[model samples]
Target: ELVLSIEKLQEIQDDLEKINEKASDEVLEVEQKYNVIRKPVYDKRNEIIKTIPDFWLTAFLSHPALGELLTEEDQKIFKYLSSLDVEDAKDVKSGYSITFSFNPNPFFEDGKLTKTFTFLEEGTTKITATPIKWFFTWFSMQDEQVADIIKEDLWPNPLTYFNN
Candidate 1:
């Protein structure tokens, strides 16, 4: 019987996944870059998201399947929404802002505000444009998704969270 430690198996899985995803020399290069950025970013971002109330509740709602069932009032409550713009089947950077609104939602008794992500400065260029809270709730949904990826896929052990 050939049993591998979860970490070892996971590492092998990562390499296999990359072989498919890393189509180009540049892609493999960037993915290597991605791993570096992710560890520093993921846990710290996750810590902050948990501090906010109603975050997981809203995040689950933000998914496309539930999003359509959302009424106008539901939209008002779950204002942390986003998407992207597509032009005749073309990839558009402009399309990425699908989920925002004036949802005036209160997560609990004390927190009337919604989510907002304070992105850390990375690499060389500075990203100064933060979401306008007046438009709706503010939080980095994408970061949390990446965090989810790390949580679901990259945890050290199968029962890392469940056991601890």
Candidate 2:
């Protein structure tokens, strides 16, 4: 009788696991729905941000995590930054990309740089950055960490950092 009870408990646990999976699936759908809802607000924010001088630079400098990553040279480079955007990956769940737009500057030939992160089938993540032209040792091994902090923290509410 005890052995039978254990088997029944296993079945109940399996059912609980299925419920957890369903909850996760539903949560992801809800998040995707909100992502669509938030797009236009973000676009408007970007538009308004352009009117403010040194907006992105101030935000970056004020960011606790990003400040550590920036050297004096990096700060100089960032002064030219006009906008920083985080775009969701195709799957959204798979990963995302961060794009940096710069004004006409003496640094790189291209006005934009994009770094993408994608989850791979090998149980690891793949990260790639556009070749920055004549830039400072700009792209570092901490590139992925930088991307994470931006995507998770700064991107959600940039004004917090900007005001800081």
Candidate 3:
């Protein structure tokens, strides 16, 4: 959570006031200018709060190989791992050194021998039966694309009659 100091809150209030003054057209459309001024500030404050933890958590939880396998226990472990001393985290490379193992056996009928499979790895291995890293990696890439689209939509280039 990002906590703002009193001075920072005052600065935000001052900036909102300035923005409210500049939005004359918006005020003209609204029944009350105070409503218009307060609405955007409230919305922006909520947006800022939502964006911070969402992005941080998304970055951590939406990792390509681990999102699906992240159980409640795993989340607790991740939080604990993330909060460790810097040296400890660094020593494990931020819990990236954790390893996993898997073994699967297939049954056979009529006393025939069946197939057996074993998978072993080290360093932040996944637990899912089918490791969908490529798909999740693409999904993770789309988060950046979504951010770019939001940025562009929020601040598009101005259109002029002569430009066309």
Candidate 4:
């Protein structure tokens, strides 16, 4: 079993706090300001997943002994992680780089509210409150997983890669 010193644990905690603070605020702001309702939640989940590959990669690279245990693809995953900083990770979600395209007249049978939303623009309608109950369900489920992944050297690879 591996034990982290108090100082090491604190450092990790601090780093995670920093990550979450920035991410949570930005995500919430987007949701509240734009009334984005669903997109913010969905986008945040995807952003978290995108960080996993890089976070795992950085862990493997820092611990070479573990790197050897990971598959080549996993190593590539780690390499990808090493390239990103906290800001880059946040930008992946908060930055208005992604665009969604939609047709105004999908049915063509009659007129309907088929407005298109692209990048930072808002949709014409607010999502109904009925299904909003499920909106935050995934957040609770994923919060712990994200916290755990960012906290410890949970990756199975050894720490030997740091030597090189």
User: Top model by lDDT, which number?
Assistant: 2
If scored against the real structure, what TM-score would every candidate get? 0.27, 0.83, 0.17, 0.20
Error of 2 at 85 (Å): 0.9
The weakest ten consecutive residues by lDDT in model 4 span 127-136
Model 4 residue 137 distance off true place after TM-score fit, in angstroms: 27
Decide which is better by TM-score, 2 or 3: 2
Ranking by TM-score: 2, 1, 4, 3
Candidate 4 or 3, higher TM-score: 4
Better of 1 and 2 by TM-score: 2
Model 1, 1-164: lDDT tens digits are 66768889899999988877556656556655665556565445545654565553354345443445446564555544221111110121111222222233453222222232233335222122233333122232324443233234323222222222
* lDDT minimum window of 10 residues, candidate 1: 84-93
Preferred candidate (lDDT higher): 1 or 4: 1
How close to the true structure is residue 118 of candidate 2, measured as C-alpha lDDT?
87
Number of backbone clashes in candidate 4: 14
Best by TM-score: 2
- Whole-structure CA lDDT of model 3: 0.32
> On a 0 to 100 scale, what is the lDDT of residue 137 in model 3?
21
Deviation in angstroms for 51 in model 2?
0.8
Question: For residues 1-164, what per-residue lDDT tens digits would candidate 4 score against the true structure?
Answer: 56768889899999999999898878766755554454455456545645544444555445544444566653542343322111112233322211111123221222211111122335322211111111112111222232223223332121333234
Runs with alpha carbons beyond 4 Å of true place in candidate 4: 1-4, 36-164
lDDT of 3 by residue, 60-130 (tens): 45443334545655454333221110001222212211111112212211111111122233433222222
TM-score of 4: 0.20
* Candidate 3 residue spans exceeding 4 A from truth: 1-57, 83-164
What C-alpha RMSD separates each model from the true structure?
Answer: 16.4, 2.9, 22.8, 18.6
Q: List lDDT for all candidates, in order.
A: 0.38, 0.80, 0.32, 0.37
